[PDB]
Design an enzyme around this catalytic site. Structure first.
Site, PDB file in Angstrom:
ATOM      1  N   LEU A  15       0.781  -1.228   0.042  1.00  0.00           N
ATOM      2  CA  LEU A  15       0.010  -0.077   0.113  1.00  0.00           C
ATOM      3  C   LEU A  15       0.882   1.272  -0.098  1.00  0.00           C
ATOM      4  O   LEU A  15       0.425   2.193  -0.429  1.00  0.00           O
ATOM      5  CB  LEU A  15      -0.947   0.009   1.241  1.00  0.00           C
ATOM      6  CG  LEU A  15      -2.118  -0.875   1.295  1.00  0.00           C
ATOM      7  CD1 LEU A  15      -2.803  -0.932   2.551  1.00  0.00           C
ATOM      8  CD2 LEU A  15      -3.048  -0.758   0.074  1.00  0.00           C
ATOM      9  N   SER A  17       5.271   2.750   1.438  1.00  0.00           N
ATOM     10  CA  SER A  17       6.680   2.516   2.125  1.00  0.00           C
ATOM     11  C   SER A  17       7.220   3.579   2.738  1.00  0.00           C
ATOM     12  O   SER A  17       6.705   4.818   2.485  1.00  0.00           O
ATOM     13  CB  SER A  17       7.423   1.955   0.772  1.00  0.00           C
ATOM     14  N   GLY A  21      10.179   0.373   6.451  1.00  0.00           N
ATOM     15  CA  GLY A  21       9.636  -0.945   5.477  1.00  0.00           C
ATOM     16  C   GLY A  21       8.654  -0.491   4.548  1.00  0.00           C
ATOM     17  O   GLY A  21       8.456   0.299   4.003  1.00  0.00           O
ATOM     18  N   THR A  22       7.437  -1.472   4.861  1.00  0.00           N
ATOM     19  CA  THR A  22       6.314  -1.516   3.828  1.00  0.00           C
ATOM     20  C   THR A  22       5.142  -1.723   4.890  1.00  0.00           C
ATOM     21  O   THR A  22       5.224  -1.969   5.943  1.00  0.00           O
ATOM     22  CB  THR A  22       6.458  -2.849   2.912  1.00  0.00           C
ATOM     23  OG1 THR A  22       5.270  -2.772   2.204  1.00  0.00           O
ATOM     24  CG2 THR A  22       6.539  -3.974   3.797  1.00  0.00           C
ATOM     25  N   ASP A 124       3.936  12.995  16.864  1.00  0.00           N
ATOM     26  CA  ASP A 124       4.256  12.982  15.414  1.00  0.00           C
ATOM     27  C   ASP A 124       2.653  13.132  14.645  1.00  0.00           C
ATOM     28  O   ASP A 124       2.470  12.513  13.871  1.00  0.00           O
ATOM     29  CB  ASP A 124       4.535  11.517  14.944  1.00  0.00           C
ATOM     30  CG  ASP A 124       5.373  11.597  13.348  1.00  0.00           C
ATOM     31  OD1 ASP A 124       5.117  12.940  12.728  1.00  0.00           O
ATOM     32  OD2 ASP A 124       5.608  10.643  12.839  1.00  0.00           O
TER      33      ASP A 124
HETATM   34  C1  LIG Z   1       1.620   3.137  11.291  1.00  0.00           C
HETATM   35  C2  LIG Z   1       0.736   2.999   9.970  1.00  0.00           C
HETATM   36  N1  LIG Z   1      -0.491   2.461  10.396  1.00  0.00           N
HETATM   37  N2  LIG Z   1      -1.088   2.292   9.197  1.00  0.00           N
HETATM   38  C3  LIG Z   1      -0.164   3.078   8.161  1.00  0.00           C
HETATM   39  C4  LIG Z   1       0.874   3.223   8.763  1.00  0.00           C
HETATM   40  C5  LIG Z   1       2.025   4.261   8.176  1.00  0.00           C
HETATM   41  N3  LIG Z   1       1.896   5.591   8.300  1.00  0.00           N
HETATM   42  C6  LIG Z   1       0.440   6.104   7.734  1.00  0.00           C
HETATM   43  C7  LIG Z   1       2.940   6.444   7.720  1.00  0.00           C
HETATM   44  C8  LIG Z   1       3.661   6.287   6.622  1.00  0.00           C
HETATM   45  O1  LIG Z   1       2.537   6.346   5.441  1.00  0.00           O
HETATM   46  C9  LIG Z   1       3.005   6.238   4.132  1.00  0.00           C
HETATM   47  C10 LIG Z   1       2.746   4.726   3.739  1.00  0.00           C
HETATM   48  N4  LIG Z   1       1.263   4.437   3.198  1.00  0.00           N
HETATM   49  C11 LIG Z   1       0.405   3.785   3.723  1.00  0.00           C
HETATM   50  O2  LIG Z   1       0.411   3.694   4.962  1.00  0.00           O
HETATM   51  C12 LIG Z   1      -0.850   3.837   3.104  1.00  0.00           C
HETATM   52  C13 LIG Z   1      -0.974   4.038   1.908  1.00  0.00           C
HETATM   53  N5  LIG Z   1      -2.202   3.816   1.474  1.00  0.00           N
HETATM   54  C14 LIG Z   1      -2.793   3.698  -0.182  1.00  0.00           C
HETATM   55  C15 LIG Z   1      -2.994   3.324   2.223  1.00  0.00           C
HETATM   56  C16 LIG Z   1      -4.242   2.730   2.371  1.00  0.00           C
HETATM   57  C17 LIG Z   1      -4.670   2.440   3.657  1.00  0.00           C
HETATM   58  C18 LIG Z   1      -4.090   2.296   4.579  1.00  0.00           C
HETATM   59  C19 LIG Z   1      -2.585   2.798   4.813  1.00  0.00           C
HETATM   60  C20 LIG Z   1      -2.133   3.176   3.473  1.00  0.00           C
HETATM   61  N6  LIG Z   1      -4.179   1.700   6.026  1.00  0.00           N
HETATM   62  C21 LIG Z   1      -4.184   1.583   7.350  1.00  0.00           C
HETATM   63  N7  LIG Z   1      -4.911   1.423   8.090  1.00  0.00           N
HETATM   64  C22 LIG Z   1      -4.397   1.209   9.456  1.00  0.00           C
HETATM   65  C23 LIG Z   1      -3.222   1.541   9.827  1.00  0.00           C
HETATM   66  C24 LIG Z   1      -2.375   1.970   8.738  1.00  0.00           C
HETATM   67  N8  LIG Z   1      -2.755   2.144   7.264  1.00  0.00           N
END
Ligand SMILES: Cc1nn2cc1CN(C)CCOCCNC(=O)c1cn(C)c3ccc(cc13)Nc1nccc-2n1
Length: 266
Positions: A15, A17, A21-22, A124
């Site tokens: 989704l 990075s 990591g990812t 943050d």
């Molecule tokens: C720590 C954490 N949790 N998290 C994400 C992070 C990381 N954070 C946001 C910081 C880094 O952001 C850059 C990476 N990009 C994404 O995470 C996402 C990108 N697309 C399109 C998403 C769609 C649904 C989704 C997450 C993403 N859904 C979700 N649902 C629950 C938790 C989650 N992401």
């Protein structure tokens, strides 16, 4: 807490990075239903500390952790918020109404009011760290820098500075002191991001130039279409002196009341 890797199914394409990591989409098999999850895949001590913070939190406006899994890599498994980060969502959906933006930032203030009552500092809080369950339901994520405050202190003192300076209050920069009031300052920057449809704050400026701007008493301008009441609230969050800056109970109340006024006008 410790999940069974046999019950987790990960998707191949990530989704998103970062340097950590990812983030991948997955499915966790429950006693009967399947649960869609977002999995942060890796440093280890930091992921475990992040998981430990999330396990202690219980609020509708905070991302829920399902557990951790130690398999090919260390994994933090969370409930999925399908629409992703708030900043990216607003960049891609520039016709989201002002009432809807107020609704989402008010949800963030409710989650932060709970974190403040729980004596945790986020450290943050930014629009990239807010995730959307739906276009009308936001949850706070990213507890990697978060700290549980000691019983005898109202702030966390960092020992040395990778910091998101454009979201940090002056006492963070000048004294390395992080409190719920420091998160209120970040929340003001998050509101500016949201009303600016995911634009980056302090465009084209270095961190030292942001410090210089704030020290002259200057603050970011009002985003296009942002109501006066919401810009006033952003400015109250950006109160230089920590002592006179409002806490999340006062911020959430202001947002709650304004949101009801807009719901009534519509
Ligand atoms: C720590 C954490 N949790 N998290 C994400 C992070 C990381 N954070 C946001 C910081 C880094 O952001 C850059 C990476 N990009 C994404 O995470 C996402 C990108 N697309 C399109 C998403 C769609 C649904 C989704 C997450 C993403 N859904 C979700 N649902 C629950 C938790 C989650 N992401």
């Amino acid at each position: 807490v410790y999940l069974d890797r046999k019950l987790l199914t990960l998707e191949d394409k990530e989704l998103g990075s970062g340097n950590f990591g990812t983030v991948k989409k997955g499915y966790y098999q429950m006693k009967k239903v399947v649960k869609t999850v977002a999995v942060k895949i890796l440093l280890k001590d930091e992921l475990l500390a992040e998981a430990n913070v999330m396990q202690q939190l219980d609020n509708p406006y905070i991302v829920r952790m399902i557990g951790i899994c130690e398999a090919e890599s260390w994994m933090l498994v969370m409930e999925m918020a399908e629409l992703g980060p708030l900043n990216k969502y607003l960049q891609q959906n520039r016709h989201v109404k002002d009432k809807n933006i107020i609704e989402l930032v008010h949800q963030v203030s409710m989650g932060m009011k709970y974190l403040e009552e729980s004596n945790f500092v986020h450290r943050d809080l930014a629009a990239r760290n807010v995730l959307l369950v739906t276009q009308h339901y936001a949850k706070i994520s990213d507890f990697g820098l978060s700290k549980a405050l000691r019983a005898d202190e109202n702030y966390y003192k960092a020992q040395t500075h990778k910091w998101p300076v454009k979201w940090y209050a002056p006492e963070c920069i000048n004294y390395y002191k992080f409190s719920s009031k420091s998160d209120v300052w970040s929340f003001g920057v998050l509101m500016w991001e949201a009303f600016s449809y995911g634009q980056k704050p302090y465009r084209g400026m270095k961190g030292s130039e942001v410090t210089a701007m704030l020290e002259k008493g200057e603050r970011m301008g009002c985003p296009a279409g942002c109501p006066r009441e919401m810009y006033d609230l952003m400015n109250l969050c950006w109160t230089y002196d920590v002592e006179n800056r409002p806490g999340f109970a006062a911020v959430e109340l202001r947002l709650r009341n304004y949101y009801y006024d807009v719901v009534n006008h519509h």
